Amino acid sequence: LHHAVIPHGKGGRSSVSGIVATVFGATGFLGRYVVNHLGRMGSQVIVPHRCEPYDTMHLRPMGDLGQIIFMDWNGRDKDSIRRAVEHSSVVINLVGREWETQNFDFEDVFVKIPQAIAQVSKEAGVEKFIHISHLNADIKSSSKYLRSKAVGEKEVRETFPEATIIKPAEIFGREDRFLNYFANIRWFGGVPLISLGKKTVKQPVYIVDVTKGIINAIKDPDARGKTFAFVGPSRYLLFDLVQYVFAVAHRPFLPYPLPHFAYRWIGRLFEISPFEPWTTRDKVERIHTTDKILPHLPGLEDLGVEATPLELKAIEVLRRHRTYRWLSSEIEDVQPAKTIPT
Amino acid sequence: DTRPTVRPRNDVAHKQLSAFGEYVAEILPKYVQQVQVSCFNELEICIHPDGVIPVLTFLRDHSNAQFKSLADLTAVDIPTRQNRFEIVYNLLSLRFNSRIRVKTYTDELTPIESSVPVYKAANWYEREIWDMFGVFFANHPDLRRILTDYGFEGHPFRKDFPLSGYVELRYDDEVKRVVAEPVELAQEFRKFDLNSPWEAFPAYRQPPE
Amino acid sequence: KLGLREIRIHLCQRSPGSQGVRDFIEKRYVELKKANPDLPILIRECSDVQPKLWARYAFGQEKNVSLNNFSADQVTRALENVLSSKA
Amino acid sequence: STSVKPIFSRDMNEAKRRVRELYRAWYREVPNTVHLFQLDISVKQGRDKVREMFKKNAHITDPRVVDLLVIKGKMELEETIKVWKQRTHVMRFFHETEAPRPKDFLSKFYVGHDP
Amino acid sequence: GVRTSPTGEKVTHTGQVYDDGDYRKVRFVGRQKEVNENFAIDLIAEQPVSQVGSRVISCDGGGGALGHPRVYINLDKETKTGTCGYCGLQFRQQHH
Amino acid sequence: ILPGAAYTEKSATYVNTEGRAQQTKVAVTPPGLAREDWKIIRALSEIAGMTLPYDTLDQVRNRLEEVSPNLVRYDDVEGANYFQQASELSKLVNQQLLADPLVPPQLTIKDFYMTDSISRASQTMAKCVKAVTEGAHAVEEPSIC
Amino acid sequence: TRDTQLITVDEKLDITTITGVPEEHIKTRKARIFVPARNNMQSGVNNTKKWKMEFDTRERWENPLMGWASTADPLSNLVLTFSTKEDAVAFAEKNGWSYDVEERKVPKPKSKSYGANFSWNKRTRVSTK
């Protein structure tokens, strides 16, 4: 170790952790939690960003003076990638959209870019590479999002053979687009569910647990070269999950079955949006997709993280979807969701 | 008084304050332990802590005293004493245009009678002493922290309390609130040794042990 | 194996309680060392210590025998029990 | 010299009566605290914390020290009841952001020089 | 004067320069390393030596009260020049 | 290689040529990953399933008290005795002296400066050795203040 | 005499619970009670009059940005002054700190004679003034 990247201090803000991390896609849901945890212990964080600097301001208080550094980069520009990794010992990729844009499609953000990041990261002598894929990524999935996750996961594994790949379930947290997605369906009256959500099982994982697992994967030598599956403790039917959301929010729950072909057409309609689609055809597939059971892969308990129940953190996410009448209701008021015994 | 740079001495005020000092010691022998006047003419009455209310009431209400205003009430921490805290009352007599100082002592576990019955100014001054020195005042209308943060642990003005304290605050995005963490400094406060090894004031030289 | 490796005798230079141990060392210690040429018998003194006899066998096990207010004869037996019988 | 002015309690039985009285007040107040401050903790968690804070001082035997801890305990109760404290002040008891620090020798040996 | 490393980084007048493997040179990416370019060691050497006709000369730095404290320099050694301990000007005795 | 701490970086006990016990204090902590010397051995012992019965500095000094009580009496010289007994055992073997002259290891000042690892690494002792073997010609430095 | 109506507490004074100090800075800290040694560079002795209490030195490290000396020790600059060793010890006991006391080092009286510098048959004669 160079004399500068030797840990010092007590793991606090002004300590030196020895980690120098380049975090791609640090400006989204998962990125802010990752950068927060790296900055807590005293890491040097390089945050390359495509967006306006105003949209990175919430990251500034996450690290001591000098510790958070910001760079501009373009996902199709290899020289911008190199400037941002050449000094780092770990490179974390959290780049992704849940929808397609005129400029960047699922092939570009989940295959082209992660592999360009992986190729440059190895040529620059980066020791650790961490790639975030998806639990349900498959070459034969009816979600173009998940088929692109599968193709990119293989390219990343070939470009950076020592890459640690983390496959999380659907992540819930204050900015998740998962339990906030369901709680925002109230704006349309009832809740359209395919097969009434009785044929779909989900295993959501808490954001902090995903973040803790990522941080350990950096500091753990064994994690290198492995693929992990980050999943929650319990498995729920989609119907029971969505019913639990509406109970925590104290909203009226009126689920009605909607045929797959129709609910596809609703997705096509919301995609015309030139901003951020409320829903897309792909989001329909992913939500109504049974979360895989991958026993051969290691999980959070291996990295040392205890998965947090959805029943301890749902009020945290869903209290802002209540009305004044129910704001003060407490975590014990609602019935726990029925869990599939697995 | 004709040395341009030397503060002149007011012998008349020294004599008057010395006389009034004996006067207070004659009337209240049960509580008065020491009386002294400084070279710049400030009278001090040192008392047993039981006499706070009797001594302060006599000074406020006696007709040859009439110290109607409590200018200040504070505490000094001296760790080398068994009674480490020195409670100081500074009083003003508008009738006679005089100030007097009354001092007493206590330790961590001993209460001092609240002087709110004599001066209503003392209410906040005692809350401050309780908060910064941890001296309890018995029979206070409401004793609680006044200066430190809610839930703050310790009494910062004790000489053995660290300058930067034990906890610092930051805003943590994960919990979306201000959190308290153990204190770390990017630059440690630099302790300077300044005391000169050569004696400066022979008149105050203490006797050899 | 399981044999004695070392002996330590702790005693005070002047205290009455150690008077027994001092007499032993003056008279009988020389013979003891000549009898056991290779066993290290460490007589370490220090003012105001309750005299003791530490014995160290193989693999770090140790035993302590008080000698407070013993007599030179008793000290001899105490050493004999250690030298002869080895755990 | 052992004669010392009492703060409140004349012996450890009078002091422990005030400890129990203060535990009842804190025990009753936790449900209201979780409600008013809108804490995500459970009422069981809050009562386990109150209990924990009461075990830290379980070894004391000086009536005057016991009285001060009770005086400080009642001061903290008032700040909570009257909502002088804020949510950040209530959640400082739970040290939610402080990462766990190793207790054993080897883990402590690998990180640094602290005993 | 200003030198550069094989990595391209400028070396300051104190000799500081991040070495090849130090990650701390990331703070200059997209920005610049601020090095003052007038090395006082180079500038004080350009000054001519002053020939004086006495054993002892005094320097106050120039400008009177705007210089440094006045000090006296012994010029008996003829194998070297007298140097001001404050400003670095050099003096030599003129073979008297 | 297991890095340790120099005498300026730990609180350690040393016994001088008189048998006086004295303890240093930590001035600065060890550099890099270096650790205290007795902690490395205590850490190694645990890894080897041979854990030692001490985990703090006070406990490793209670152990020193069991082996030799004088090692924890700081600044106190504990006198020894029993010289008569020591001489008696000395005579038994009767070894034979040699005819070599008694030449000390250090004869001139130049052998004094660099004698252990700390002084061998010092560049000041390096200039001291140069000065006493080569004169002031190559050791001089221009000094102005 | 004093008539407050007093109790009798026979326990040792121990104020750790009521001081607000975190746990790790009482159990693990060793205090040093000592009279400071005279600075050898000077002959003044007025800084060797009082007893001092200081705490064991803990890690300082280099700040990544500026290179300043960073610390996580809240007691690094803490020094207390006492008149006697018994005063210093009592303070450490009630605060629960373990301490190692060091007895005062008093310079010994020397026999100085100016006339000895010119002795007739002794070695104390000086060859220069």
Ligand SMILES: NC(=O)C1=CN([C@@H]2O[C@H](COP(=O)(O)OP(=O)(O)OC[C@H]3O[C@@H](n4cnc5c(N)ncnc54)[C@H](OP(=O)(O)O)[C@@H]3O)[C@@H](O)[C@H]2O)C=CC1
């Ligand atoms: N439930 C979940 O959230 C789950 C997420 N994942 C994966 O985790 C990773 C993080 O997801 P999350 O961060 O939550 O999604 P976000 O949209 O919250 O953040 C995604 C990041 O991707 C960046 N990004 C997207 N497209 C581009 C582009 N073309 N060029 C550059 N940057 C781009 C965005 O930057 P900007 O803000 O500048 O557009 C944003 O910072 C993704 O790979 C996602 O697939 C996997 C399983 C579950």
Ligand SMILES: [Zn+2]
């Ligand atoms: Zn000059």
